[PDB]
Amino acid sequence: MIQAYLGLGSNIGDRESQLNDAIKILNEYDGISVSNISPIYETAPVGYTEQPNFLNLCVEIQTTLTVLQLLECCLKTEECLHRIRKERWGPRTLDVDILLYGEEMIDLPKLSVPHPRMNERAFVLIPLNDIAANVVEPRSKLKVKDLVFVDDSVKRY
Ligand SMILES: Nc1ncnc2c1ncn2[C@@H]1O[C@H](COP(=O)(O)CP(=O)(O)OP(=O)(O)O)[C@@H](O)[C@H]1O
Ligand SMILES: N#Cc1ccc(CSc2nc3c(=O)[nH]c(N)nc3[nH]2)cc1
Ligand SMILES: [Mg+2]
Ligand SMILES: [Mg+2]
Ligand code: NA
Ligand code: NA
Structure with missing residues (x-):
């Protein structure tokens, strides 16, 4: 049994409903x-x-x-939520990213864990800190609470 953390995003459609359906x-x-x-x-x-x-x-x-x-x-889960993948990036119904998988570090063509951009993203770290303040990010070896930073572009919905 492994403790993992996923990052979810939605910026098109009924964003809240799509996030709650994804979790289910x-x-x-x-x-x-x-x-x-x-x-x-x-x-x-x-x-x-x-x-x-x-x-x-x-x-x-x-x-x-x-x-x-x-x-x-x-x-x-993304497919279930009809995530579109056009030639250029655009709005998405659902994005499900693996942030952390225990303390493992994986670097495969189709999979990088910890997520390569998570340590510089307030939209990840702020919510992650709510549930994983004391979890160690294995590349930096820091707890999430020592990575999180204030960002006014991230607001409680
Ligand atoms: N930690 C991870 N979580 C999810 N997908 C990952 C991943 N590391 C690599 N991938 C790969 O990334 C591919 C494309 O994912 P998208 O979801 O299209 C990138 P996205 O999340 O918009 O961008 P982002 O990675 O900057 O957050 C997936 O098919 C998957 O193989
Ligand atoms: N639309 C759009 C779009 C915007 C950004 C990107 C690059 S990856 C990315 N994911 C997210 C995300 O879940 N939230 C925020 N606030 N920014 C992001 N940036 C890709 C597509
Ligand atoms: Mg993403
Ligand atoms: Mg993704
Ligand atoms: Na289950
Ligand atoms: Na790689």
Whole structure:
């Protein structure tokens, strides 16, 4: 049994309903049990052009799946929520990212864990700190509470 953390985002459609449906679907896979859910935050898009605001949250799971089995479940959940993948990036109904998988570090073509951008993203760290303040991010070897920083573009929804 491995403790893992997922980052969820939605910036198109009924964002809150889609996040709540995603959590339910994730929890319904055998080998995944959702054990904690952060508050929802409304967040300014980063890393791209002006786009609709996201709702973001983090989920704690207890899992007996391998990290690649877990990735399959995350991507399937996105498919369930009709995530579009066009030639260019755009708004998405649901994004499910594996942030942490125990203390493991994985660097495969289709999977990087810990998530490569998480340590510089308030839309991850703020909600992650609500549920995983004392969890160690294995690359930096810091607890999440020592990575989190104040960001006024991330607000409680
Ligand atoms: N930690 C991780 N969680 C989820 N997908 C990951 C991942 N590491 C690599 N991937 C790969 O990333 C591929 C594309 O995912 P998208 O969800 O399209 C990137 P996204 O989350 O918009 O961007 P981001 O990674 O900057 O947050 C997936 O098919 C998967 O194989
Ligand atoms: N629309 C759009 C769009 C915006 C940004 C990106 C780059 S990855 C990314 N994910 C998120 C996310 O869940 N939330 C926020 N606030 N910014 C993000 N940036 C990709 C597509
Ligand atoms: Mg993402
Ligand atoms: Mg993703
Ligand atoms: Na389950
Ligand atoms: Na790589």
